[PDB]
């Protein structure tokens, strides 16, 4: 239930070798507004696939 | 002999004339068509590689399409391979139908079983549950002990513990073939075969006597 020798910083980084974040990896450009957004999501201005939606 | 690749259509029953229901599994066996023949002089073993069904044109890749194009055959949904039995002979592009089982009397059906996910040892290994009362403290379905003491001080290999049950190749042997229907491309075997409905099966003749 508890460790018996203090683990090293080696073993610590080895465990964290997988904790890395993946980048976005490329975010797509709107058809009409020409601005960037996550794919399959609406843009910050509220367009999606070149048509105007929300408009708040 | 060789086998054929089917597809588990589901289960029904077949009332006999003297009133005995037979639980059958319906296996649609379309035209398995040979895409490659393998000889000792090139591969070290005699075996045929068949395909079956049909695949979309845009979903088959260029390696795969070049393989089926060499064979002179329509792309199917997969490639399988059957070892040949020393006096058998097939050609590439030859179609094989359920008619092959018109004599066989008893088959072996190989599929992937239904995946039950991470299963505990009561489901998985039929361990027996400890007391459900009489004092028992948080250990009802747990595996108990897992080994001995200082001697060995290790858990032995292949100790039955919990983990992924299901979703693996299983072969059911010696199933009685009830009907061969060359018209509808069907094979009715007596019993349950592995897999959910629509799963790919592999039906060979029975190797047991």
């Amino acid at each position: 239930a508890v460790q018996q020798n203090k683990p090293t910083r080696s073993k610590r980084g080895m465990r964290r070798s997988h904790d890395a974040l993946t980048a976005v990896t490329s975010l797509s450009v709107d058809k009409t507004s020409g601005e960037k957004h996550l794919r399959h999501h609406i843009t910050a201005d509220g367009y999606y696939r070149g048509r105007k939606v929300i408009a708040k | 002999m060789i086998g054929l690749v089917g597809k588990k259509v589901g289960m029904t029953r077949i009332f006999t004339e003297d009133g005995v229901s037979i639980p059958v599994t319906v296996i649609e066996v379309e035209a398995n068509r040979v895409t490659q023949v393998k000889d000792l002089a090139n591969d070290g073993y005699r075996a045929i590689q068949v395909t079956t069904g049909a695949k979309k044109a845009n979903r088959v890749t260029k390696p795969e399409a070049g393989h089926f194009a060499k064979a002179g055959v329509e792309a199917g949904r997969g490639l399988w391979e059957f070892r040949l039995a020393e006096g058998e002979e097939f050609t590439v592009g030859q179609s094989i139908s359920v008619e092959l089982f018109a004599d066989v009397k008893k088959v072996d059906v190989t599929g992937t079983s239904k995946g039950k996910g991470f299963a505990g040892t009561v489901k998985r290994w039929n361990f027996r549950t400890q007391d459900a009362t009489h004092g028992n403290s948080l250990s009802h379905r747990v595996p108990g002990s897992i080994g001995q003491n200082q001697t060995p001080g290790k858990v032995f290999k292949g100790k039955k513990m919990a983990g992924q049950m299901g979703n693996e190749r299983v072969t059911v042997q010696s199933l009685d073939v009830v009907r061969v229907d060359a018209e509808r491309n069907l094979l009715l075997v007596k019993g349950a075969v592995p897999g959910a409905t629509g799963s790919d099966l592999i039906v060979k003749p029975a190797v047991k006597a």
Partner: protein, 114 residues
């Protein structure tokens, strides 16, 4: 499942009479005793009907010279030779399992007559 639907309806018998639970039914059944093939009769109240096409069953409950018997029958079996409805019966449920607890005057089903 057009394969299975096509394949089962090749076996379904055509002249199964319309009955509903509550009905007193005589069912004639092929009973084989060595070489002779007899046909015996089992009359009782339908207490349950499962409709699944070929896999359609129905449970008939008799009180046979003593204690009570429930035969579940496969409707489309070749064993089940005849079904005839003796007394049409008026109940409100669909599965009459409460009658397992009642005998005699309590287990008494009104007649339907419409």
């Amino acid at each position: 499942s057009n394969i299975i639907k096509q394949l089962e309806q090749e076996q379904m018998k055509q002249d199964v009479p319309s009955f509903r639970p509550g009905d007193t039914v005589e069912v004639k059944v092929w009973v084989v005793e060595g070489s002779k093939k007899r046909l015996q009769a089992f009359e009782g109240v339908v207490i349950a009907i499962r409709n699944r096409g070929l896999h359609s069953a129905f449970t008939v409950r008799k009180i046979s010279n003593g204690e009570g018997v429930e035969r579940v029958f496969q409707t489309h079996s070749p064993v089940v030779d005849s079904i005839s409805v003796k007394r049409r019966g008026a109940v409100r449920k669909a599965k009459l399992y409460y009658l397992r607890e009642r005998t005699g005057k309590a287990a008494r089903i009104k007649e339907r007559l419409n």
